[PDB]
């Protein structure tokens, strides 16, 4: 029963075998583990669909491509709020006057972090697999299965 | 009676049961579906540029205070409605705007 | 959407996309925190609000006064005597409300 979850699913392990000869090898004399949810947090920033994957790419330019024109004019808007509330240009930057992060410095460091790669690759898991289970919903039943194949890291 | 059916929880599950027992029609349909893609559409036709406007618009300027711009475009937003009849009872000045703050240090 | 033409629009100019995420959510954008905000949790009323915002953007060079112009000169939605009554403070500016609300209301 539920015939086309099988079908699904057996697709998925025929391909994880194809990609991955040594997961038929039996009683773990393979040097791949299997590790449920709460022992892969040390591999998470491993798997990265950097190549193979452009929409998080076009995302990143055109947000910091956006920042960029408007950074400036909102250092103004607080110098100016600064000037009105107190008479001084430093009612915000007393404490940190240090370094004054504007909008396009935010960016920047929001962007480059650490993390960043891994929340654009699960972004990227996150959407195809939500697309997947509305098109599964409405019933097409064909090409319900992603691979991404990208090199040092498979995912379907 | 409005309050009362505003009672109602609106959950996710009540929401889709809603909308099973009592299907939207197909222009309801799509207009939920594309809501995103017809507000920017209606944004484009004033953040992409400067269109023709009335003359008598440009006595209102940068540094005209903030209650009169909300007076004027309350006035000119619901002219359909009130046929050119004011509005009162609504503006409250702007709380950084309204105040010219200084702050005393030591000598100053 | 088979057409792509509102999203094309949108993202071969960023410029659109700064414009429209400082305007103040009054004024149809999607800039929901006001400068005023930073201060006071009580607003009062938020066009005003909305428009000083504006007028502190245009100043700076954030936006420019021709959007203020093209708002100010906008065509009136479709609003009845109940959509002023309902909520004040609002405009006839059409799209204000989203879809979510909508779909509270119709359940």
């Known amino acids: ?156 | 009676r409005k309050q009362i059916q505003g009672y109602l929880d609106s959950t996710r599950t009540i929401i889709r049961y809603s909308l099973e027992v009592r299907p939207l029609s197909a222009k309801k349909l799509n207009t939920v579906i594309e809501y995103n893609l017809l507000y920017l559409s209606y944004n484009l036709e004033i953040i992409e540029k400067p269109n023709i406007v009335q003359p008598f618009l440009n006595a209102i300027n940068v540094d005209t205070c903030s209650i009169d711009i909300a007076r004027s475009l309350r006035k000119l937003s619901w002219a359909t409605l009130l046929n050119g009849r004011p509005i009162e009872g609504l503006e409250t000045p702007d709380p950084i705007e309204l105040v010219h703050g200084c702050l005393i240090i030591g000598s100053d | 959407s088979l057409s792509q033409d509102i999203t094309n629009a949108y993202l071969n100019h960023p410029i659109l996309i700064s414009r429209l995420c400082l305007l103040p959510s009054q004024l149809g954008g999607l800039n929901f925190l006001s400068c005023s905000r930073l201060f006071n949790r009580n607003i009062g009323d938020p066009l005003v609000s909305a428009i000083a915002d504006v007028k502190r953007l245009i100043k700076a060079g954030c936006l420019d006064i021709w959007v203020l112009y093209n708002i100010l000169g906008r065509r009136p939605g479709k609003g009845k005597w109940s959509t002023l009554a309902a909520d004040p403070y609002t405009l006839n500016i059409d799209y204000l409300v989203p879809s979510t609300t909508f779909l509270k209301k119709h359940a």
């Open chain 1, 1 to 156: 029963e539920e015939s086309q979850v099988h079908a699904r699913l057996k697709q998925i392990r025929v391909e994880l075998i194809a990609r991955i000869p040594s997961l038929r090898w039996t009683r773990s004399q393979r040097e791949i583990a299997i590790l449920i949810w709460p022992r892969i947090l040390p591999i998470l920033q491993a798997y990265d669909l950097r190549q193979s994957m452009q929409l998080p790419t076009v995302w990143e330019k055109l947000t910091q491509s956006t920042v960029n024109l408007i950074s400036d004019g909102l250092e103004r808007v607080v110098l100016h709020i600064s000037n009105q509330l107190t008479g001084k240009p430093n009612l915000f930057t007393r404490s940190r006057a240090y370094s004054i992060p504007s909008t396009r410095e935010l960016s920047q460091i929001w962007f480059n972090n650490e993390w960043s790669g891994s929340v654009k690759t699960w972004l990227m898991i996150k959407y195809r697999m939500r697309q997947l289970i509305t098109n599964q919903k409405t019933g097409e039943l064909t090409d319900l299965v992603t691979i991404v194949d990208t090199r040092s890291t498979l995912c379907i």
